[PDB]
Amino acid sequence: ASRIDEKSSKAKVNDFLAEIFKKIGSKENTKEGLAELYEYKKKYSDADIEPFLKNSSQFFQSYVERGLRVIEMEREGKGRISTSTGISPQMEVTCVPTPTSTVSSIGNTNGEEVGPSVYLERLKILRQRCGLDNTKQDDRP
């Protein structure tokens, strides 16, 4: 424990945030990292994050702030996502549109049919690079 204790307060939070940034830094985990940052920012309406941004390099700070607004736009559903209510392509005119393999979609998953798993899986994978979560007994492992 420390008398200032203020350092300890930001110490824990920074590490958590740091994990989110590493996801942002990777191209693959950018959606995941941005999405959590947006949600976290929503929880704390920012406020808490600013000290962290100054702490890191200045150039990198502008992009993250810009990226967060666009994530919300998708959540809002405004119009980027939308194209039509639900119209299937037709050559000329039909009584009823006919579904096709391209037009139709199939929901297939392989152990990743739950949202939390992506977070658990991606973060661990980035994380093992940082360290090892493998603990073993010193005596006859």
From Swiss-Prot:
Changing L123 to A/R: Disrupts interaction with TACC3. Belongs to the TOG/XMAP215 family. The TOG (tumor overexpressed gene) domains are arranged in a N-terminal pentameric array with each domain composed of six (for the most part non-canonical) HEAT repeats forming a oblong paddle-like structure. Intra-HEAT loops are positioned along a face of the TOG domain and bind to a single alpha/beta-tubulin heterodimer. The TOG domains in the array seem to be structurally and functionally polarized. Differential functions may range from microtubule (MT) lattice binding and/or free tubulin heterodimer binding to potentiating stable incorporation of tubulin into the MT lattice. Binds to the plus end of microtubules and regulates microtubule dynamics and microtubule organization. Acts as a processive microtubule polymerase. Promotes cytoplasmic microtubule nucleation and elongation. Plays a major role in organizing spindle poles. In spindle formation protects kinetochore microtubules from depolymerization by KIF2C and has an essential role in centrosomal microtubule assembly independently of KIF2C activity. Contributes to centrosome integrity. Coiled coil: none annotated. This is Cytoskeleton-associated protein 5. Interacts with TACC1. Interacts with SLAIN2 and SLAIN1. Interacts with HNRNPA2B1. Interacts with TACC3 independently of clathrin. Interacts with TACC3 and clathrin forming the TACC3/ch-TOG/clathrin complex located at spindle inter-microtubules bridges. Interacts with NDC80; indicative for an association with the NDC80 complex. Residues 116-141 are annotated as: Interaction with TACC3. The lineage of its organism: Eukaryota, Metazoa, Chordata, Craniata, Vertebrata. It is found in: Cytoplasm, Cytoskeleton, Microtubule organizing center, Centrosome; Cytoplasm, Cytoskeleton, Spindle pole; Cytoplasm, Cytoskeleton, Spindle; Chromosome, Centromere, Kinetochore. The modification Phosphoserine is found at S45. It comes from Homo sapiens (Human). Overexpressed in hepatomas and colonic tumors. Also expressed in skeletal muscle, brain, heart, placenta, lung, liver, kidney and pancreas. Expression is elevated in the brain; highly expressed in the Purkinje cell bodies of the cerebellum.
